[PDB]
C-alpha cells in the first residue's frame, strides 16, 4: 500500500458562505458496530460534512490515496 | 495498491453560497453493522455531504485513489 | 490496483448557490449490514450529496481511481 | 486494475443555482444488506445526489476509473 | 481492467438552475440485498440524481471507465 505525491513548480480561490440553521445534527465519519464479529473500515481523503458543506480546490497539488482494507483468514 | 500523483508546473475559482435550513441532519460517511460477521468497507476520495453541498474544482492537480478492499479465506 | 495521475503545465469557474430548506436529512455514503455474513464495499472518487448538491469542475487535473473489491475463497 | 490519467497543457464555467425545498431526504451512495451472505459493491467516479443536483464540467482533465469487482471461489 | 485517459492541449459553459420542491426523496446509487447469497455491483462514471438533476459538459477532457464485474466459481 504505497501512495506517492509529487508537486514541482483578480480573485482566485475565493469563497463566501453564509449559513443560517436553526437546528443541526452532523455525523461526520462514523463506524458503528452492534453485536458484530469483524468490521474493517477505512476512510481516506477529504470528507467534508455539514448542514452546509463547501469544498473548494481540494487537491490543486497532486494527491494520492492508497488503501488496502480487509482480512485474511 | 499503489497510487501515484504528479503535478508539474477576472474571477477564477470563486464560490458564493447562502444556505438557510431550519432543521438539518447529515450523516457524512457511515458504516453500520448490526449482528454481522464480516464487513469490509473503504471510502476514498472526496465526499462532500450537506443539506447544501458544494464541491468546486476538487482535483485541478492530479489526484489518484487506489483501493483494494476485501477478504481472502 | 494501481492508479497514476499526471498533470503537466472574465469569470472562470465561478458558482453562486442559494438554498432554503425547511427540513433536510442527508445520508452521504452509507453501508449498512444487518445479519449479514460478508459485505465488501468500496466507494471511490467524489461523491457530493445534498438537499442541494453542486459539483463544478471536479477533475480539471487528471484524476485516476482504481478499485479491486471483493473476496477470494 | 490500473487507471492512468494524463493531462498536458466572458464567462466560462459559471453556475447559478437557487433551490427552495420544504422537506428533503437524500441517500447519496448506499449499500444495504439484510440477511445476506456475500455482497460486493464498488462505486467509482463522481456521484452527485441532491434534491437539486448540478454537475458542471466534471472531467475537463482526463479522468480514468478502473474497477474489478467480485469474488473468486 | 485498465482505463487510460489522456488530454493534451461570450458565455461558455454557463448554467442557471432554479428549483422549488415541497418534498424531495432522492436515493442516489443504492444496492439493497435482502436474503441474497451473492450480489456483485459496480457503478462507474458520473451519476447525477436529483429532483432536479443537471449535468453539463461532463467529459470535455477524455474520460475512460473500465469495469470487470462478476464472479468465478
Swiss-Prot record, chains A, B, C, D, E:
4 X 11 AA tandem repeats of [EGS]-K-T-K-[EQ]-[GQ]-V-X(4): region residues: 6-44
Record note on what altering residue 27 to Q does: In PARK1; no effect on protein structure; no effect on phosphorylation of the protein; no effect on membrane- and lipid-binding; increases oligomerization; increases fibril formation; increases secretion of the protein; impairs copper-binding
Result for mutant: residue 30 to T: In PARK1; no effect on osmotic stress-induced phosphorylation; increases oligomerization
GO molecular function: actin binding; alpha-tubulin binding; beta-tubulin binding; calcium ion binding; copper ion binding; cuprous ion binding; cysteine-type endopeptidase inhibitor activity; dynein complex binding
Record note on what altering residue 34 to K does: Increases oligomerization
Binding of Cu cation, residues: 27
Record has Transmembrane helix as a keyword: no
Repeat (Sequence) residue spans along the chain: 10-18, 19-33, 34-44
GO annotation, cellular component aspect: actin cytoskeleton; axon; axon terminus; cell cortex; cytoplasm; cytosol; extracellular region; extracellular space
The family this protein is said to belong to: Belongs to the synuclein family.
Function: Neuronal protein that plays several roles in synaptic activity such as regulation of synaptic vesicle trafficking and subsequent neurotransmitter release. Participates as a monomer in synaptic vesicle exocytosis by enhancing vesicle priming, fusion and dilation of exocytotic fusion pores. Mechanistically, acts by increasing local Ca(2+) release from microdomains which is essential for the enhancement of ATP-induced exocytosis.
Disease implication from the record: Genetic alterations of SNCA resulting in aberrant polymerization into fibrils, are associated with several neurodegenerative diseases (synucleinopathies). SNCA fibrillar aggregates represent the major non A-beta component of Alzheimer disease amyloid plaque, and a major component of Lewy body inclusions. They are also found within Lewy body (LB)-like intraneuronal inclusions, glial inclusions and axonal spheroids in neurodegeneration with brain iron accumulation type 1. Parkinson disease 1, autosomal dominant: A complex neurodegenerative disorder characterized by bradykinesia, resting tremor, muscular rigidity and postural instability. Additional features are characteristic postural abnormalities, dysautonomia, dystonic cramps, and dementia. The pathology of Parkinson disease involves the loss of dopaminergic neurons in the substantia nigra and the presence of Lewy bodies (intraneuronal accumulations of aggregated proteins), in surviving neurons in various areas of the brain.
Domain notes: The 'non A-beta component of Alzheimer disease amyloid plaque' domain (NAC domain) is involved in fibrils formation. The middle hydrophobic region forms the core of the filaments. The C-terminus may regulate aggregation and determine the diameter of the filaments.
Protein's name in the database: Alpha-synuclein
Organism, as annotated: Homo sapiens
Amino acid at each position: 500500500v504505497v501512495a506517492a505525491a509529487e508537486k514541482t513548480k483578480t480573485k482566485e480561490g475565493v469563497l463566501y458562505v453564509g449559513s443560517k440553521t436553526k437546528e443541526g445534527v452532523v455525523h461526520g465519519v462514523a463506524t458503528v458496530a452492534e453485536k458484530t464479529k469483524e468490521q474493517v473500515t477505512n476512510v481516506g481523503g477529504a470528507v467534508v460534512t455539514g448542514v452546509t458543506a463547501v469544498a473548494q480546490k481540494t487537491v490543486e497539488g497532486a494527491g494520492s490515496i492508497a488503501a488496502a482494507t480487509g482480512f485474511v483468514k
